[PDB]
Design a binder for this molecule. Structure first.
Ligand SMILES: C[C@H]1SC(N)=N[C@](C)(c2cc(NC(=O)c3cc4c(cn3)OCCO4)ccc2F)[C@H]1F
Length: 379
């Protein structure tokens, strides 16, 4: 506990493409790069020669593969994948020295799922059984890992960003990955990693909305989403405030809606024109909260693949949502995040690797006095 040198820097990725960990499946071990995803609950891997894939799971080569004789069809809002369920032996080379028999969805058909040019071939769904497909009887990977081994029921994520890197500490916390203290928010319900936001500030200025709006219909912590996604009404108020605070320069309306990029000359991004964003999260104690604060370095994201521009272009990575608040990479890149499943709580601390400048730093601060925090949750 406390120090896990072998798991430090076990995450890789490229801008806009996610964070993946190396895993092995089957006997003899087949190496795959697997997207780390706290926003879903299936372990699902490419199993057929899709042209976008560097490699795929070849079940015929595994002596320990067991067929579950069941299919699964998983439609997303935009993409889809279809697979055949089975179990096999799974290990994480730069994780704990253990081997687990886990459920694997062998992906046999997909659409808009794999990314052309990405270096991952599967997704590790780290959330709970309640949102696993086809149903909650398909035990998620981490549940299998904890049941079958002596690995503690906790993992932590340091997502670094701006090619990317970071650490997934399985079964522990590594104190070198953060500064200051961890502050914990309760996991409201074990399905997604659901949390409650009690207050929102832009540059210290309160949005003054009914706090139910912040969590309509839920708020989640999701390593598998890029953006900070906010409920439509909250996004409207947030953008209005961000526009006002950033009034020194004017931008087209499309930029704020993520419909167009905005570009600047290299090394001349005016970060200081853009405001900080603070989310107050429900604390561990009645009437107690804490505040997490991100910078423009988190929410204005570089787009490097612009062939029609020589300048440095950025995507506004705060967007409107119909699925509630999503605390994606925009949030998580500022922080070391502890998914303390054993105690049904999520810890936040300032990330030792977060991108900042000489004037401002991402922050985790408390305690604050906040009343009626239970009323902020949507029912
Ligand atoms: C709808 C999503 S949300 C979801 N949570 N999981 C599913 C399993 C899903 C996710 C992804 N994610 C990414 O590609 C990606 C990219 C990032 C990034 C994070 N994630 O942060 C740094 C910048 O780039 C891709 C496919 C996919 F199916 C879906 F449920």
């Amino acid at each position: 506990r406390g120090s896990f040198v072998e798991m430090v820097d076990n995450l890789r990725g490229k801008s806009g493409q996610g964070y993946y960990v190396e895993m092995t499946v089957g006997s003899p071990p087949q190496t795959l790069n697997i997207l780390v995803d706290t926003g879903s609950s299936n372990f699902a891997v490419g199993a057929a020669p899709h042209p976008f894939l560097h490699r795929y799971y070849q079940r015929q080569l595994s002596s320990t593969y067991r067929d579950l004789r069941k299919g699964v069809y998983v439609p997303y809002t935009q993409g889809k994948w279809e697979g055949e369920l089975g179990t096999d032996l799974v290990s994480i080379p730069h994780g704990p020295n253990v081997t687990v028999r886990a459920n694997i969805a062998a992906i046999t058909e997909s659409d808009k799922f794999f990314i052309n040019g990405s270096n991952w071939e599967g997704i590790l769904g780290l959330a709970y059984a309640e949102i696993a497909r086809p149903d909650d009887s398909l035990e998620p990977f981490f549940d299998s890992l904890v049941k079958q081994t002596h690995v503690p029921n906790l993992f932590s994520l340091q997502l670094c960003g701006a090619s990317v890197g970071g650490s997934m500490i399985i079964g522990g916390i590594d104190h070198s990955l953060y500064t200051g203290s961890l502050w914990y928010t309760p996991i409201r319900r074990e399905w997604y990693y659901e949390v409650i936001i009690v207050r929102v500030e832009i540059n210290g200025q309160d949005l003054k909305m009914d706090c139910k709006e912040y969590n309509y219909d839920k708020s989640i912590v999701d390593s598998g989403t890029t953006n900070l996604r906010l409920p439509k009404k909250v996004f409207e108020a947030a953008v209005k405030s961000i526009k006002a605070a950033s009034s020194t320069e004017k931008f087209p309306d499309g930029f704020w809606l993520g419909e167009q990029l905005v570009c600047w000359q290299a090394g001349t991004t005016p970060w200081n024109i853009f405001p900080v964003i603070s989310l107050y999260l429900m604390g561990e104690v009645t009437n107690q909260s804490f505040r997490i604060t991100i910078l423009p370095q988190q929410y204005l994201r570089p787009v490097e693949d612009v062939a029609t521009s020589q300048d440095d272009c950025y995507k506004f990575a705060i967007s409107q949502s119909s699925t509630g608040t999503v605390m994606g990479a925009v949030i998580m890149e500022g922080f070391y995040v502890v998914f303390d499943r054993a105690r049904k709580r999520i810890g936040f601390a300032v990330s030792a690797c977060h991108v900042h400048d000489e004037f401002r730093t991402a922050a985790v601060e408390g305690p604050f006095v906040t009343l009626d925090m239970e009323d902020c949750g949507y029912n």
